Structure formats: C-alpha cells, structure tokens
C-alpha cells in the first residue's frame, strides 16, 4: 500500500554527500511512501516543482522565482584536488588560499549550461580580484579528478568529493571563508505537505549527528 | 610534437592516470593530450589519424587496427550494507544470485556499452534479470544503491568510490569481467608509443600483473 509517491529532484554531485543516507532513512521511517529520485540541474528543478513533476528539489543555486521557496541547508567547504607530488600537497594538513592557485592549471567542470559549478568557482576568484590565467573546462568531476591524478592540473571541488579516492590524488583544504558551495532545498511556494515536512525532519536528524548547528527558524514545522 | 591518447571514462578509476603520470614525469618535454571516447569512436579515430593510441573495453576487429588485451578486470556487485548479498562479501556471489534483484544498468549512452556488456554476460548463461533500469552513469547507479533501491554490477576499480553504507561484493563466475585493450593502427617505428607500452609494463610489474607481448 503506497499512501503517496514523493518525487525528489537533485543535483548529481550531492550523491557523494549526505543525500543517499537521508533518502535511505526517510524511506525506512516511512515505508508507506514511494520515493522517486530524478537527477536534474537547479534551474530544471524550478520548472519541475511548479508543474508538480517533483515535490522537493535539492540544488546548489539561489535562483529566485515567486512560485518557489527555498531554504539554505548548509554551506559545504571547497577543497583543492591535487597530485600528491604537487607542492600544494605539503599543505594538506594546514590548507591553502585561492590566491595560491592563480598560476596553476585549473580544471573547471562540468560542461553544462551556465550558471554552474564552473561559473560558481570563477565568481569566488573574481570576488577577490583574482583571475586564474590557466583554465580548462572538462566534462564532469571524475574526468577532472582523473586528469589531476594523471598530472594535468588541479581542481576545486566540494569537500564531499573525498568519497572518491584515486591513487596519488590528494585533497587540500581551502581556507578562504567564502570558499564554499551551498546546498538548498526548494519546494513550491505554499504550505509543505506532511510528507515534505517528514523529509525536513530526516535532514534535521542527520544534520544533528554531523554536529551541524541550526540557524534561526531553520526548516519550519506545521 | 605530442601524443594523442583516447580512453574510455571508466579507466580513470583504474591505472590510467598512474600510467600517464609516470609517462609524463619520464618525458617532461613531451605534451600529452587525453581524449575521452568510446571504443568504436577510437577505432574510426585511429584509422583517420586523430589519435595515436586508444584504451578501450570492446572486442573490436578491424584490418587497420592492432589491438592487444592488457588485462581482464573483475566485476563486483555494489550493494547496500544491509543487503542479504553483503553477507557473502568474503566468499563472493554468482550471477545467478542476482536475477531477482533490481539491477541498475549504466550508462544510458548509445549501445553497445557497459550495459550491453553486463546483460550479454547474463544471457551467455541463460539468465534474464526481469527488474532492470538503465541510468545515466556509474555515480548515479552507486548513489541510487546507497539510497536503498537496487544493486549494480561494476568494474572492481569502481571501489575508488566509497559512499556511506555502500559495499562491493566479488562476483565468482570466471567470465564476470570487463577487458582493457590498447589499440593502435598497424604501425611500427614510433618511440613515444613504445615508451607508453613500457610504462604500462612497469606499472603492471609493480602491481604484480603479468605482461602482454612485444
């Protein structure tokens, strides 16, 4: 007996973070629900929500539309993926700053419509009057990491990319406080169903385990 | 000059980067150009002189192309930590154990591809999984498994990806494998490509893998 099908849009990179354990726990606690997962970019999620193709969208862009509302879940730290022989890797335990990377061969990704993670990264550089001269855009994250592991350059990546460990690939912390990539949950701009509120609580629960501290009024009830 | 090397994406989780890095370090003066592409695309590209060597996973046959089996990589089953099949992690399981499970095939790109490869191995033994879904790529398959719907057959080097509560189980059927080939046109005097062969031979020896002929 399925009480309801809940449909969830998500950006692909979130699979390397908490998304799967959140969905697994949500399913487990709510065996009366059928949950369907649809990979789609943040802009695509907006249209999908409006016409009911999905019920919640987990995205990385803050893109306003009156018919949608969103809540920032957390800011994920960025890191520098480097070859283990790279000078920057001597700072693995201490971290580095964006201005240390301006003369390095940087692999941006993905190849997809902009804005995306690539523009996101370049905007953080531009916010501090930094203009990396050696830039190359590649198809997606694992191509970027493979090329770093091969000796082709370095890449800025979400911290949860560390789910991928390749031989002679290292991840160096980036210390600039604004060196982050957000995670949002977006829903239609109306009162959330009992089912979506249940999803909020699952996120709350996992976040508490991760020791994340809740901001004021974070994920409403009722 | 420079050397153009075609490769299938799944090889990035294996020894490809390590080979390329050792190769680069030995020849800092040479520039290397790595191009992601399928095995059929590599073949046509070799014949047209658009790449120098192609690392692929398909048993192709062309008069123009000299192909060499480097090694067979084992297949594994990606499962949730809680899955019954994960009780045989140390022993391993067989293809026939999987036919009533929800299997995630990938990628969704044009066939023949890894999906066709996996389904062909099942059908080579009269096995026909009824619950199949073809998804876009490997990380989607793994994420969906970890979220608690499905299992997926994957190359063993896929273990580079470790997701929370994702576990990989060995497959025991001897033909549960995916080959790796190096392909070049029927060619001779080229020192850079001979040095690529030797770089592979060096990495394989260090790993303990047996070597191909020369």
Curated annotation (Swiss-Prot), chain B:
The keyword Transcription regulation applies. Cis,cis-muconate binds at residues 10, 39, 114. GO terms for biological process: catabolic process. Benzoate 2 binds at residues 15, 55, 71, 113, 204. GO terms for cellular component: protein-DNA complex. GO terms for molecular function: DNA binding; DNA-binding transcription factor activity. The keyword DNA-binding applies. Keywords: Activator, Aromatic hydrocarbons catabolism, DNA-binding, Transcription, Transcription regulation. Benzoate 1 binds at residue 10. Homotetramer; dimer of dimers. The dimers can also associate to form linear, higher oligomers (in vitro). Belongs to the LysR transcriptional regulatory family. Positive regulator of the ben and cat genes for benzoate degradation. BenM is necessary for ben gene expression but not for expression of the cat genes, which can be regulated by CatM. Binds to the inducers cis,cis-muconate and benzoate. Contains a secondary binding site for benzoate in addition to a primary effector binding site that can accommodate either cis,cis-muconate or benzoate. The existence of this secondary binding site may explain the synergistic effects of cis,cis-muconate and benzoate. This is HTH-type transcriptional regulator BenM. It comes from Acinetobacter baylyi (strain ATCC 33305 / BD413 / ADP1). The lineage of its organism: Bacteria, Pseudomonadati, Pseudomonadota, Gammaproteobacteria, Moraxellales. The gene is benM. The chain holds residues 90 to 303 of 304 of the full protein.
